[PDB]
Paper text:
Here, by combining cryogenic electron microscopy, genetics and biochemistry, we identify Balon, a new hibernation factor in the cold-adapted bacterium Psychrobacter urativorans. We show that Balon is a distant homologue of the archaeo-eukaryotic translation factor aeRF1 and is found in 20% of representative bacteria. During cold shock or stationary phase, Balon occupies the ribosomal A site in both vacant and actively translating ribosomes in complex with EF-Tu, highlighting an unexpected role for EF-Tu in the cellular stress response. Unlike typical A-site substrates, Balon binds to ribosomes in an mRNA-independent manner, initiating a new mode of ribosome hibernation that can commence while ribosomes are still engaged in protein synthesis.
Residue numbers in the entry:
A (entry chain Cl): 2 to 273
B (entry chain Sn): 2 to 89
C (entry chain Ba): 1 to 44
Write the structure that this text describes.
RNA sequence: CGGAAGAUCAAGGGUUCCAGUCCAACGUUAAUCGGGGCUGGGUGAGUCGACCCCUAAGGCGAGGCCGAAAGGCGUAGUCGAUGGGAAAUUGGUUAAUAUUCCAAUACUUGUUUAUAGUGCGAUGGAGGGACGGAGAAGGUUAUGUCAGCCUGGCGUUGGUUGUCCAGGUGAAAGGAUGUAGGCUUACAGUUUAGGCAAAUCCGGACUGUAGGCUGAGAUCUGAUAGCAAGGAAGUGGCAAAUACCAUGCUUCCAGGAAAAGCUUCUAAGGCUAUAAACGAAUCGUACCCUAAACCGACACAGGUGAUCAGGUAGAGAAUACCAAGGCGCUUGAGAGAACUCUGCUGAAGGAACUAGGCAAAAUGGUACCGUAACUUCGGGAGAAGGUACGCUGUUGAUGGUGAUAGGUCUCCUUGAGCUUUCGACAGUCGCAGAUACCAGGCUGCUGCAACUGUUUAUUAAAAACACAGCACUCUGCAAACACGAAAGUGGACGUAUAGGGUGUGAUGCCUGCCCGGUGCUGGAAGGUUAAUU
């Protein structure tokens, strides 16, 4: 849940942290770990290709099994760990044969329960099933887009999808973005909603809390000069121009979707 | 071989350090080839001063000094010298 | 105050040194141009 | 001067290091002197560092991909320390080197030979190495101080053979031991949807049986060393680090390098003990390094990373005076005008000065008492404002350490000596007792920005930027978006509770009307409309 901080300091007056006393306080499973260094949002040309990235805490990469190809072999949840690489929690699995893996953790998933993968699996949070073996109306996550590729959609804290139905070899889904989508019925999904449902509910409280996460400050375009931003310029405060990115592209309703090969996989979107 | 050991020793060193070391510890100070190892020096001394056995060899590279002359700036050759200890 | 030069030998030989010049087409053109002038110092 | 202006380095420099000699030039003067000239000398390593093995970021990169050319990228790899990986300390010695030479006592790692036993072997598997921030309680030592002991001294001036004065005096690494601490059930057997094949090794599942690892410091040994007047001492108390136990422990979220060395397992196809002898290459080592030797054109009041860290006061690495050590900053001598700079004191008045209390003056410590509006209940607040403070004597309480005794790096009671922190009473001196250095000035109204932060290197530090928070909008993943010519990248080994763009800027109360214009989104009845034909 959330826990407000006492206003003992001005920097602590609006710190509202998410606290989970049920998650592992120890260190992650060593063998499922990878070194991972910050990039500062720079590509192989050394250029900033995504701004406001840089800094933060060193963190390992936990190798999450987004594929779940160990079918018909039961695994028990050894422990639920915190993951710095994502917002969701991760369950340490313990397969019958002793092999240990990390998966995204469902909200309704605790330590000790058994998780199954494959086609003949119970409909319980944690199990990974092809979209044809999942009855309509259940809440799922970790949605595959290609067969055998691994989970792509609904992988963030609190993510969930509504399996609306089937119209042949596709499965109609309703994503949290409000977009109705068809996906091949042979793709897999995991039952339940993703844990850490109270993540959006938090409040960092101070500028240094965002610096701890690798985020650098962001300078509004109207705070610039015209040589740096289309919004730059002016004696005093002024916008003067239609809102636009520093590269000259509208940011108040201009739709930017170029794909014409996936255009037939999308039923509709939602207007609100 | 035995035609490279004749070129290991370039000449003895005559100084206050070399003269004081001989009288007290009986260690000979030589100027040696710029490429002579401690093994080559050990094998050159005992071949070429018959009757002596070398305990240890202490080598060092010492750099030549810039001694200007006339209108030019010129430097002295660097060189290597060895302290060799002989059995008492 | 802190001045502009602040020497470092490894940094000097790694950005202006002989092997740094020879590792690019334009660095070899620098060396060819020093040699055509007859400079006694090719590389730092 | 002495948390350096003393010492050890790294970087950088390169002979500036030491000696002899010279004084033209150089040195802001003179110079017999010098970092100057000239001539000689000087840097000694299996253990310090480099090299070497290993890898990070990042490079280069058989084949590969991409690109008019040049070239760009990239796999296997191969490089790349600022990190990981073997090992010695004391003392003496030179004019100049010292963990290097010499003496003593150690340690690490190889080669060869021999004696036995005997399944060895990897670029592969598994362990290990291997790691964050903060905080706390201890135990220590380095070190200090007094004492003891030894050697000298009896003081130009009252006294000083004593409870007097001065100087000196404490050996390390290593080997035994295994303490204060910290962690911690052990073995055997059966078996195997796993560790890409194999595995007796790991991992997993079952059945019986019931102190160990690490570890500062102390102690013993090392240990008849060395060290002054010509042949001496060298062991007890107390205090005590930011260093060690400790890569520990406890906590928190922002969730904490890699690889190899090393231990084990096998795959294709020599090894372990015992010793004996022999070896451990090469490169650096001088000297400066809060500087006259580096970066600043200068022997320039600047800048320059790390290490050591004495005494008396003191919370202290502040500050003052000193120690070891090192210096007096390479023009002096006079005089004692105006004026300038930097200080000290100032009658009476006390902001009348001035754009403005600019500057100056003032406040300043500890303990205790006491403290308003307002408030987001945290604060405001050290609000404001008061009282005590030195020394001497007596006396009460108390923490630590613990000799001597009574019941084996042990435990319990008593407690000598030393030491800690608090009181009370009495007296006493001065203008003054937080006496020096050091060390808040404080209130009332009001605009702005929530706050910590950032910025115009070198006239602007702010109300400007950022900021947590809010909103809109885009984006379904080969995501949007960005670099790129493309390949390839970042976004992201992320996935709509996510990512981008834009605006606003904590919080409280809130955020009205206008879609005519220009954007944006949706629609297509009609009009017009390119190449082409």
């Amino acid at each position: 849940p959330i826990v407000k901080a006492k206003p003992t300091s001005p920097g602590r007056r609006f710190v509202e942290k998410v606290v989970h006393p049920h998650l592992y306080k120890g260190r992650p499973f060593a063998a499922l770990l990878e070194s991972k260094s910050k990039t500062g949002g720079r590509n192989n040309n050394g250029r900033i290709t995504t701004r406001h990235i840089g800094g933060g805490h060193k963190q390992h990469y936990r190798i999450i099994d987004f594929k779940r190809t160990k079918d018909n072999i039961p695994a028990t949840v050894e422990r639920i760990e915190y993951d710095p690489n994502r917002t969701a929690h991760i369950a340490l699995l313990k397969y019958a044969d002793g092999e240990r893996r990390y998966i995204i953790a469902a909200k309704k998933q605790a330590v000790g329960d058994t998780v199954m993968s494959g086609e003949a699996s119970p409909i319980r949070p944690g199990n990974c099933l092809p979209l044809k073996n999942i009855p309509l109306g259940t809440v799922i996550h970790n949605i595959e887009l290609k067969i055998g590729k691994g989970a792509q959609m609904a992988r963030a804290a609190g993510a969930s999808v509504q399996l609306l139905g089937r119209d042949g070899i596709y499965a109609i889904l309703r994503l949290r973005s409000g977009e109705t989508r068809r996906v091949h019925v042979n793709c897999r999904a995991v039952i339940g909603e993703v844990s850490n449902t109270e993540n959006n509910l938090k409040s960092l409280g101070k500028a240094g809390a965002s610096r701890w996460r690798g985020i650098r400050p962001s300078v509004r375009g109207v705070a610039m000069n015209p040589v740096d931003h289309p919004h730059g310029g002016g004696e005093g405060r002024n916008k003067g121009r239609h809102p636009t990115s520093p590269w000259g592209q509208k940011s108040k309703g201009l739709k930017t979707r170029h794909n014409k090969r996936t255009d037939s996989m999308i039923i509709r979107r939602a207007k609100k | 071989n035995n035609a490279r050991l004749y070129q290991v020793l370039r000449g003895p060193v005559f100084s206050e350090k070399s003269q004081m070391l001989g009288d007290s510890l009986g260690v000979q100070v030589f100027k040696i080839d710029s490429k002579a190892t401690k093994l080559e020096v050990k094998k050159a001394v005992e071949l070429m001063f018959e009757g002596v056995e070398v305990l240890k060899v202490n080598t060092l590279n010492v750099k030549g000094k810039t001694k200007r002359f006339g209108k030019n700036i010129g430097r002295r050759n660097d060189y290597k010298k060895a302290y060799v200890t002989l059995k008492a | 105050m802190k001045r502009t030069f602040q020497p470092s030998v490894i940094k000097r030989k790694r950005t202006h040194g002989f092997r740094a010049r020879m590792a690019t087409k334009k660095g070899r053109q620098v060396l060819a141009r020093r040699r055509a002038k007859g400079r006694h110092r090719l590389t730092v």
